[PDB]
Amino acid sequence: DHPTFNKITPNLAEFAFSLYRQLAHQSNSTNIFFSPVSIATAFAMLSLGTKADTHDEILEGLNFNLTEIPEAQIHEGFQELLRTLNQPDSQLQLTTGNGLFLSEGLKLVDKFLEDVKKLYHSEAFTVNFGDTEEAKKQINDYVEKGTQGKIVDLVKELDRDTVFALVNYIFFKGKWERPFEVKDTEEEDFHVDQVTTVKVPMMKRLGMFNIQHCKKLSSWVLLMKYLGNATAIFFLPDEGKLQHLENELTHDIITKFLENEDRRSASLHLPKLSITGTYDLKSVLGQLGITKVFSNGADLSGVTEEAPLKLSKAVHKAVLTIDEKGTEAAGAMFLEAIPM
């Protein structure tokens, strides 16, 4: 109808949730950091030159019910979301882009190319896949331009036969509505594990905060806002209640919280952070039921007639830093495609 992205918004959310869920399942013991939006738009703008069964899995896995939703509309939804994120915020920077990087031989299904520039405002670049160390370069930079040098080495190894790659970033820098005081930031204990305690710098404010505790989610939940059009939500489980929380999470619940601007007096202690996460998503997207593009069954004939292609890598990397003054994060995704 009107700004359309909330047509897709929970579909995103429930994806994030679920992808997340896989990442949890993988190892209880790691820091997880990804960016849903970034992973998603890529597989969205990819879907747009995939046909049949293989198209259907992507969108499927993304948690779109094609029966219920015009595919044509999905793409629209996304066009909007992007658009809007990249709207200029006076106080807060949020920027994303998408690039396609093409072997200069490749003759493209012309419509695929207008599709991606249109709907995903994508950028296109013409490349020699025969200079792997200079292409790999040219790629790494776009991203490292893009995320203001927060991610630099997204592409660690690139294929010798690569036909093209779809690369997509996000960069975010925001400042807390009510930042902390750096004096008050005092090095306190974090119990990682039941045997491991590590010392961390703990930033502290005493004040009037957006916090509560849901018997529901068996946690405390805090929302912290940014000077801008954005907010952070931190979910501190009760003891033993961690997987409990992890499962009970739903977009509804998220939107419920967001309607609250009801504050409470507390003593908040929250660590200062920098963390990364680096993933080869084939596998975990395997789980989410997206498998055909990575195999010999794939159909990227919306892309190019010349030869049957396929995906051979899907690599996400995101990094975050939370300090007193705000947060800055970034994220990037990389898809590579080859002849079968």
């Binding site: 939006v37 931190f234 961690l242 003593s267 963390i275």
Partner: protein, 36 residues
């Protein structure tokens, strides 16, 4: 403690949304901060 002292000294979860679109900008879980 008055007020209540909520300490994020155990592994927690979090996410970043954009207000307008209500889109899940970024999702995370810290388990060990000194695991860079």
């Amino acid at each position: 403690s008055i007020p209540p002292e909520v300490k994020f000294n155990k592994p927690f979860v979090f996410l970043m949304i954009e207000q307008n679109t209500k889109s899940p900008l970024f999702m995370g879980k810290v388990v060990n901060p000194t695991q860079k």
